[PDB]
Amino acid sequence: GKKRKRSRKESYSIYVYKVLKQVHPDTGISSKAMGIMNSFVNDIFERIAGEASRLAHYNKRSTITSREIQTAVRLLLPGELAKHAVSEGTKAVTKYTSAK
């Protein structure tokens, strides 16, 4: 083998895979398709975060809470997508708090 480790490069791909095997267990994903799924996750991270950042800033608050994320989500996603995304985020917070 050869010396010097290539420098770390973060991605979401192991989590895209994991979600992929829930939804379509007998289905894989190409190299460039994963590059797209990455570019997607990063896009929506940025959009949501930015809007929450602004919401917090408008109402004179230092802290982004799950509340901000929800409001941003309601502003950014279309109708049905927002509902489900609001449900799942709520579920996730509810579940996380009670498992402390």
**Residue 5 region, left (φ>0) first, then alpha (ψ -120 to 50), else beta?**
beta
Q: What is the CA radius of gyration of the chain?
A: 17
Q: Closest distance between DNA and the C-beta of residue 65, in Å?
A: 6
Query: Cα–Cα distance between 63 and 71 in angstroms, integer?
Result: 14
**Between 14 and 23, whose beta carbon lies closer to DNA?**
14
**Between 39 and 83, whose beta carbon lies closer to DNA?**
39
Residues that bind DNA (CB under 7 A): 1-2, 4-11, 13-15, 28, 63, 65
**Between 3 and 79, whose beta carbon lies closer to DNA?**
3
